[PDB]
């Protein structure tokens, strides 16, 4: 029940930690709710790594949890409010292609999770992932490629 009890504008930023593929760190100017959701996800990851390593697999818990590299969570959280791209570009030192990349890789995952919440039977996760996805794709981050048109 980690994600179910949050706002839809925080679950997108919480899930931005699986896709960014950029040098990661925690944050300081973060709400309390995000600063604890990050810990809850990391604890769930610790449990999964503990059931992997205590079973016979050779992948230490540190190696599994090191794929989670947050550090664009706050940037995605600010993007999913109505914040134009320029302020995000200013915000932090990550190249402006690798940000559109991560957002492109997240708005397509919060939509297969919108498709999976109907399968598990959580219509409140369905009704929150169908909001966090439709509010994430509006502008030049999702500009159509020239070749196709």
């Amino acid at each position: 029940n980690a994600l179910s009890t949050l706002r839809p504008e925080e679950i997108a930023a919480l899930l931005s930690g699986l896709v960014c593929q950029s040098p990661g760190d925690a944050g300081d100017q973060l709400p309390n709710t995000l600063k604890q959701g990050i810990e809850r996800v990391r604890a769930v990851a610790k449990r999964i790594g503990e059931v992997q390593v205590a079973c016979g697999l050779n992948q230490t818990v540190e190696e599994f949890v090191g794929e989670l590299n947050f550090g664009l969570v706050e940037v995605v959280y600010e993007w999913a409010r109505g914040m134009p791209f320029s302020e995000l570009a200013g915000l932090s030192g990550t190249p402006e292609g690798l940000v559109v990349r991560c957002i492109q890789r997240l708005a397509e995952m919060c939509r297969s999770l919108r498709g999976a919440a109907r399968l598990v039977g959580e219509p409140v996760l369905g009704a929150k992932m169908e909001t966090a996805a439709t509010l994430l794709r509006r502008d030049i981050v999702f500009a159509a490629s020239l070749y196709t048109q």
Binding site: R118, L119, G121, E122, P123, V124, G126, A127
Partner: protein, 794 residues
């Protein structure tokens, strides 16, 4: 066509088949294809709860199948498909099934015939038997067994008989058993036998359990069989094992509806906290009856609990999942499906009332009344009577509401109160007072006694007797805690009498210890009206500005400030324009009044702008007219804006424009006024002003004859009123005195007397002085202007 049909896309296949039929008419395969296409469309129609379309499609499919059967009546598949069509209309709420079967099917080929439900099912069974006669296969045997099962089910469900359908059930079991022994390796036959074995008329659960287990073993990927076992366990008080079967079944097929409904039922029985969400998910998948009723029940029950509206249970679920509209649509579908169950109707009425769909709520309560005519329990019938009568009273037709409230035992507070309100609405104020006092007799919950006292005050005031109403409201004030409604009613009553003495005391009482009131606009209105009574007329605007300063939000407050500035102290026109624009910006639904007031303020201002387009008075009043074309004030504003624009163009001296629209706007004003309930004095003022403005506009443009005919018609309509006659004088005397001419003293004295007829109007006097200047009697003009000056100053 057949290939397109294979992939869905039924419409294209139907069109292709029809084109083929147009050329050749006896082409059997095209006829057969048309029949299956209509049958599939009918089944898809029945998956969503559209029961009329399905009947239409099946009727047409029978048409096509008989057309095919005239030519080749040795083929089996045609007979079998006919039987499928006939028997797929079970559970379609009879009195919705009237099917126009025609021809060979009914033995001899006579004309046409309209068949009801049982007859249709019998014809289906006959068709399956005939098909089986000439080609004995297992599938037809199984289908025949199912048809006999459906006939027995239909007979029982209408309570038409019992113990006289035994042979039908034994025949059904015989057919299913024959099918199973014909090929005992098919999960379908075992499953069908199991389901029939557990019918209420037979009740052999061991055989049913055996059949479902054999079906599961025969083919392991079977959600249907697992859910049927789950039901078998669940009805016989085995919650745990039924839970096991349902959970595994949905593990095998995540989008099967019945397993989810069973899970919801189990969760409800054991009292979990996520049962409501489970029902919501069930609603999201597809429309089943059981899930529908469950979700509606939970939505209504949650609405009842009034300690919720901070919980984030109520807030999120109801107000962000739009639970109420979903429940309404769900219940509409359910009720059309079942239509013999009263609580469904009552919940539908409750939800419709919350959507302010009052007419449909009245219909729902009406149907519930009809259902409950005869029943063991009469209290629910009385409660239904109160509710239907209350909604009937809410929207006109008071006589019907009164009759409904008569036909009930008037002994509980709710029923008596509703009767009182209906009586008051029709008239009969004495009767309403009697009902309210009688209700006061049996009263707890002192809030209710205070409210009844206030209603008594209102109703007796209506007759007159303000003194007793006043004393009664003070008596209410003597109660332990005031209600903010007796104090507010007292202030309004004080204002209704032109004395501010008690109104001030009541206002101070209201403000002192009341903060739980959450209007914050009504108190400002009362304070401002109180100040206006004393004629202060400058404090009023200052007071409203103070209120807006306290609470800089609330578009309503800004709009009220704009309106008062337009009415009282119209020298801060610029501030009023700014206020109206601000009120319009801060929302959209206050557009109407705010735009009206800001347009009027711009009118008052003059032309104090940079001669900028898109922000003149005409544009804003036009915007308001587009937003709400219902009130007459916007149309009058349009008249004023057109005239003002004419004058501005005249000042720049380029061209008069927008020439002839006054008559249309006047007709619009009258038509719009006709539908306003009562602001009688205000409505009269508006119509009078519009008439005068239209006449003056007609004079200005130059269409003297039209103004003349308008005035003549108006005076022929009603007896004389000394205002319009002045307009007739003005229209008369325009040709004359435009060219120099001498006038006879008779007309001049007549005009002076006419002006005296309608005095207390500075315009008229100024116009008369202009007349004096025209002929030239200056000192007399000076005197007329002086009289106007004295009148204005006073």
């Amino acid at each position: 066509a057949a290939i397109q049909q294979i992939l869905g896309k039924y419409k294209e296949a139907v069109a292709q088949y029809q084109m083929i039929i147009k050329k050749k008419e006896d082409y059997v395969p095209a006829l057969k294809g048309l029949g299956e296409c209509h049958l599939m469309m009918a089944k898809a129609a029945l998956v969503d709860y559209l029961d009329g379309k399905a009947v239409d499609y099946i009727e047409k499919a029978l048409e096509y199948f008989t057309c095919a059967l005239q030519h080749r009546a040795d083929v089996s598949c045609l007979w079998k498909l006919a039987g499928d069509a006939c028997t797929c209309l079970y559970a379609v709420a009879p009195s919705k099934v009237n099917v126009h079967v025609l021809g060979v099917l009914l033995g001899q080929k006579e004309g046409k015939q309209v068949l009801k439900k049982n007859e249709l099912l019998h014809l289906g069974g006959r068709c399956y038997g005939r098909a089986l006669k000439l080609m004995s296969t297992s599938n037809t045997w199984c289908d025949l067994g199912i048809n006999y099962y459906r006939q027995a089910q239909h007979l029982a469900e209408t309570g038409s008989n019992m113990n006289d359908l035994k042979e039908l059930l034994e025949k059904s079991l015989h057919c299913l058993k024959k099918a199973v022994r014909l090929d005992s390796n098919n999960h379908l036959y075992w499953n069908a036998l199991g389901v029939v074995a557990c019918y209420s008329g037979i009740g052999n659960y061991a055989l049913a359990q055996h059949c479902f287990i054999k079906s599961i073993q025969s083919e392991q990927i079977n959600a249907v069989a697992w859910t049927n076992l789950g039901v078998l366990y669940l009805t016989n008080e085995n919650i745990e094992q039924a839970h096991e079967a349902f959970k595994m079944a949905q593990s095998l097929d995540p989008s099967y509806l019945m397993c989810w409904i069973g899970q919801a039922l189990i969760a409800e029985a054991v009292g979990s906290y996520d049962t409501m969400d489970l029902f919501r998910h069930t609603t999201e998948l597809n429309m089943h009856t059981e899930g529908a009723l469950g979700y509606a029940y939970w939505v209504c029950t949650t609405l009842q609990d009034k300690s919720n509206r901070e919980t984030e249970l109520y807030q999120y679920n109801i107000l962000q999942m739009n639970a109420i509209p979903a429940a309404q649509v769900i219940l509409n579908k359910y009720v059309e499906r079942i239509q013999n169950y009263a609580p469904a109707f009552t919940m539908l009425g409750y939800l419709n009332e919350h959507l302010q769909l009052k007419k449909e709520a009245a219909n729902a309560y009406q149907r519930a009344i009809l259902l409950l005519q005869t029943a063991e329990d009469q209290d629910t019938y009385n409660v239904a009577i109160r509710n239907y009568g209350r909604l009937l009273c809410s929207t006109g037709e008071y006589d019907k509401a009164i009759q409904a409230f008569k036909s009930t035992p008037l002994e509980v507070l709710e029923d008596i109160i509703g009767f009182a309100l209906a009586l008051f609405m029709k008239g009969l104020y004495k009767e309403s007072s009697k009902a309210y006092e009688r209700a006061l007799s049996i009263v707890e919950s002192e809030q209710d006694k205070a409210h009844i006292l206030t209603a008594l005050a209102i109703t007796e005031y209506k007759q007159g007797k303000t003194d007793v109403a006043k004393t009664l409201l003070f008596k209410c004030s003597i109660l332990k805690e005031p209600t903010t409604e007796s104090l507010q009613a007292l202030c309004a009553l004080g204002l209704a009498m032109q004395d501010a003495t008690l109104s001030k005391a009541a206002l101070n009482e209201l403000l002192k210890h009341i903060k739980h009131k959450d209007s914050n606009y009504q108190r400002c209105l009362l304070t401002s009206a109180i100040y206006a009574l004393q004629g202060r007329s400058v404090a009023v605007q200052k007071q409203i500005s103070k209120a807006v300063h306290s609470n800089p939000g609330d578009p309503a407050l800004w709009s009220l400030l704009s309106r008062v500035v337009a009415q009282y102290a119209q020298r801060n026109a610029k501030g009023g324009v700014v206020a109206g624009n601000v009120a319009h910006i801060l929302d959209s639904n206050h557009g109407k009044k705010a735009l009206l007031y800001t347009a009027v303020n711009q009118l008052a201002m003059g032309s104090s702008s940079a001669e900028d387009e898109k922000n003149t008075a005409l544009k804003t009043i036009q915007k308001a007219a587009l937003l709400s074309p219902g009130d007459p004030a916007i149309w009058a504003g349009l008249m004023a804006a057109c005239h003002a624009d004419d004058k501005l163009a005249l000042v720049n001296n380029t061209q008069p424009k927008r020439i002839d629209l006054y008559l249309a706007l006047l007709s619009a004003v009258s038509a719009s006024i006709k539908d306003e309930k009562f602001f009688e004095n205000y409505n009269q003022s508006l119509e009078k002003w519009s008439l005068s403005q239209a006449v003056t506009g007609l004079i200005d443009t130059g269409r003297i004859s039209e103004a003349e005919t308008l005035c003549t018609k108006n005076l022929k309509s009603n007896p004389d009123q000394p205002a319009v006659i002045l307009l007739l004088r003005q229209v008369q005397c325009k040709p004359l005195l435009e060219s120099q001419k001498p006038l006879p003293d008779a007309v001049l004295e007549e005009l002076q007397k006419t002006v005296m007829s309608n005095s207390t109007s500075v315009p008229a006097w100024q116009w008369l002085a202009h007349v004096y200047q025209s002929q030239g009697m200056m000192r007399a003009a000076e005197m007329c202007y002086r009289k106007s000056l004295q009148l204005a100053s006073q």
